[PDB]
Amino acid sequence: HSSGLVPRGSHMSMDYIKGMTWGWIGNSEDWRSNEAERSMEEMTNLAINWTAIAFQGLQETAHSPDITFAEPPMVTDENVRWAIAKAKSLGLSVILKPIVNVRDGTWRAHINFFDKDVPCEPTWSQWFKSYESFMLHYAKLAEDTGCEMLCIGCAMVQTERREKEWRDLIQKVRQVYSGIITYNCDKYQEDEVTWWDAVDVMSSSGYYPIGSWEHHESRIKKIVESWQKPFFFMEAGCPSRLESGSVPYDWNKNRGQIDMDEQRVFYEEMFKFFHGQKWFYGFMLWDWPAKLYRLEDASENDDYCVYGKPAAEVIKSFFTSNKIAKR
Amino acid sequence: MDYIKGMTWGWIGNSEDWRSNEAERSMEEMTNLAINWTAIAFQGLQETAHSPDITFAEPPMVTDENVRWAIAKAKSLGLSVILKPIVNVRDGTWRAHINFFDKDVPCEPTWSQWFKSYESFMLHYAKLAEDTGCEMLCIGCAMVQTERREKEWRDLIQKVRQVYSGIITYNCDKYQEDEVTWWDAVDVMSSSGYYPIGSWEHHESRIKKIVESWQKPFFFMEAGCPSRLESGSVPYDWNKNRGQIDMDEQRVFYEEMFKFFHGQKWFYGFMLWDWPAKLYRLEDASENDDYCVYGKPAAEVIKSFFTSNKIAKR
Ligand SMILES: OC[C@H]1O[C@@H](O[C@H]2[C@H](O)[C@H](O)[C@H](O[C@H]3[C@H](O)[C@H](O)[C@@H](O)O[C@@H]3CO)O[C@@H]2CO)[C@@H](O)[C@@H](O)[C@@H]1O
Ligand SMILES: OC[C@H]1O[C@@H](O[C@H]2[C@H](O)[C@H](O)[C@H](O[C@H]3[C@H](O)[C@H](O)[C@@H](O)O[C@@H]3CO)O[C@@H]2CO)[C@@H](O)[C@@H](O)[C@@H]1O
Questions:
Q1: Nearest residue to B273 via CA among B247, B291, B259
Q2: Within a 13 Å sphere around the CA of A43, how many CA atoms are in the beta-carbon half?
Q3: What range does the domain containing A131 cover?
Q4: CA angle at A287 for the pair A282 and A293, rounded to the nearest 5°
Q5: CA distance linking residue B158 with residue B155, whole number of Å
Q6: Which of A63, A120, A207 sits opposite B97 (nearest CB)?
Q7: If you ran DSSP here, which 8-state letter would residue A26 be given?
Q8: Which one of A189, A220, B243, B268 has the fewest beta carbons within 10 angstroms of its own beta carbon?
Q9: What Pfam families does the annotation carry (chain B) (predicted)?
Q10: Do the Cβ atoms of A112 and B105 come within 8 Å?
Q11: Which residues line ligand 2 (CB under 6 A)?
């Protein structure tokens, strides 16, 4: 498996990702609606060639070992096979992205256990066994459906120090899934994962504020060059809200306070600094819902979604531009 | 260092409870355990396990006047005092999970923010400990996921030493005696002795080796067990089998703990858990499921242990 700028041929240079995330948060009833097919078709007008099929699994608290998946209201295996096949039927390559959320609302980056096993607390080994059942379930589904890529986790910051357990999980994933593996580290954490060598492609969440993108391009370029792996953004986006570009990751910032231009300016700056560099492999944007609002409602919508908003035209002109289209 | 024969008083630290007529009577009754120490214990609060701001000395938490009262009352009863300010989390998360990213990032609160807030809380009470002549200050309790922040703990302890001239301890959690790298920075090692029935001989051997490796005094800053069905298997679990009364279970826990931990010269005794500011009636004791031993057989085990000549010689 071990490889540098190019994943070994048996797992596929690496594609340049022109992507949009579809289906979050992963609600069976939404994915089985008529609306879901129309949503995914409309998403193709972004001139994407990839989609990340994203959906939640659940644990009760940040310190509980048991992860539930594929039970109401979460997506069924049939819902997931449908989304993958529909995406492929539209000419998209697929990243399967199972994401653990915490029922009590805690940000998943805080999921954590004591360093030292004690008789009175759940252990890292218990949580990793549950997380392995979750991720291997979907790794097997990714193999059966021919997903080009699997993302084995997303911003699991307080688990990343568990290097032996992550490398053990990745070895188990390799036994059931033959495609490309990535892990999506959180914003600002590109240099903090000690096991990047164990995946094929490095990726992070590009929620960097307006005015910071030139700085982050220099920072990330040096990290990627130190690892000699391909790198892309597994998430990047910004809500269409007042001052959201200062905190593009904060999905609770200024709800209902619409600013289309703020989202537009975020995208223009991100693409100004991250474009066609040979070490960079593009963008999986965030995000596009299974049930898409009416075009007539777009100018009053405060979501990350770009549908009907000026940012969609920045994305389309970037993805159809010769410099990007040739990558 | 004294041999501690102690009971914790006042938890969770509710101003209304501490100002009740009942509080004085509760503390007087506690002296019948033949204790010579009490830990005056009370909460501060932060919203979540990952929020940096600690609130204290605001309703419903104890006023500074309430804390001066409890310290002076205890001393008026001939007791030495450990002051024990404890941070809790409003959302109910066990404080051992309080934690921040190792690496400062612009999008999250930082260790330095939380430690500044924790410093404000602990230095407030260190100054009150000094002003009131508390013999000892406990600078934290089972803060497991902070203990790796060694520089910040040592920095806090330096600030506490500038304002408080008494004995400092830190109370590590059950099973964590060998896991604190900065024991040297406090005067006395302490832990939470919530070891299950059948395990005390094992833990005496484990802890003896840890304490002799450090060459510092050690005692249990907490130890106890609810009077509940099968509580002795998980003495620390305050939610285990609520309302399912078993006096003998609590009694057996105490007899075993004292069988194995007694007069060893490396060992400096027990701060037991715990005794409320508002004490239940004696006639309600046989239906009470709390850690409190008042009116229960375990109280007689404690009294006979604390008044025994081998423990009286220490
Ligand atoms: O879909 C309804 C569901 O929304 C829940 O909040 C979500 C937000 O709406 C965003 O979709 C948010 O996106 C973040 C993801 O968690 C990414 O993995 C992360 O890296 O950044 C993006 C952008 O902020 O996700 C949350 C869920 O995690 C929530 O409000 C829920 O109650 C509601 O039903
Ligand atoms: O006093 C009412 C208050 O109780 C809260 O629960 C407490 C329990 O009743 C116990 O007193 C428990 O004691 C633990 C302490 O946290 C020690 O520091 C720890 O080391 O172990 C002991 C023994 O288990 O403390 C909790 C509070 O932390 C809670 O139910 C609250 O809602 C209620 O108002």
A1: B291
A2: 35
A3: 1-327
A4: 140
A5: 5
A6: A63
A7: -
A8: B243
A9: GH113
A10: no
A11: B 11-12, 86, 88, 141-142, 192, 222, 236, 238, 273-274
